[PDB]
Amino acid sequence: AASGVATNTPTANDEEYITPVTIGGTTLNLNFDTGSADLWVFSTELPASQQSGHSVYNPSATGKELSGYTWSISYGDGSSASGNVFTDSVTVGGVTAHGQAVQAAQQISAQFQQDTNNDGLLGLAFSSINTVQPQSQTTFFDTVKSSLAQPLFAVALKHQQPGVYDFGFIDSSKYTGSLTYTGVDNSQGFWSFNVDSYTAGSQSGDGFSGIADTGTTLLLLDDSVVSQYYSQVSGAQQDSNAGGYVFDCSTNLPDFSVSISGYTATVPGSLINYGPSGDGSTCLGGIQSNSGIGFSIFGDIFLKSQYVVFDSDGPQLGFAPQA
């Protein structure tokens, strides 16, 4: 059976987490995203000026082209990328997927051209949302799952410290107590779960659904929830230069918790201080609006407080406080 551990590292302020991946012999630093199902990388098919500052995949060296297949994806923050497809060997934490579809970028939007922290994304959402045309392909996880000791992956994302991606096994030393599981609705291709209620400092409210997403930096909630939270933070104000609600870095922030199948997942107020707003003397809040989309995005701010198991059997999500 196979299993493996890949180490992740946050970039400045934990904006994103990158992990090395070897594709056809070349190691690239990718952002693992449980919110999408495409494995795409910077390649030699991009204009030379865009390859700058990145490790790039050269498809002609080792990939097998899928004649006539294309891919095109657009993300929640407005970024997008597109290209062609090859199959190659992909190794993550010593687990190798042979014949994994690799989406070589031909076009990337400005957000990606400006980000030199990563060399592409490795999607970990369900394969049902992979964008390859005319026939969708399976994610790295779906490609290898039958070979793992257990068909699951688990993650521990940390605040300014290296974390891990466990593939095919659960490391019990990464959390306190026992895991609590909840069912996942994968109808929209995400690792979606329900919360029965929430507590924002001194205020509690009714439940809602959300997706566990390693690819989103913050905890994005309904505006009602955001208002309620910030109404308890002295001097909090929206700052479009910063991207949302900001406050004095010294502010004591209330905690935020959700009740999941009887388990209370708590994000301490210290983890809600994201960092310097990068606009004056304030800090940006880890909780911001979801723009009215109807569901919440449990991004890195939330994840930094738990060890999370993504189990294909159910499917289901397991949670426990990080040790």
Binding site: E15, N31, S79, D213, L218
Partner: peptide, 4 residues
């Protein structure tokens, strides 16, 4: 930050 980003929103994948």
């Amino acid at each position: 930050x980003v929103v994948x």
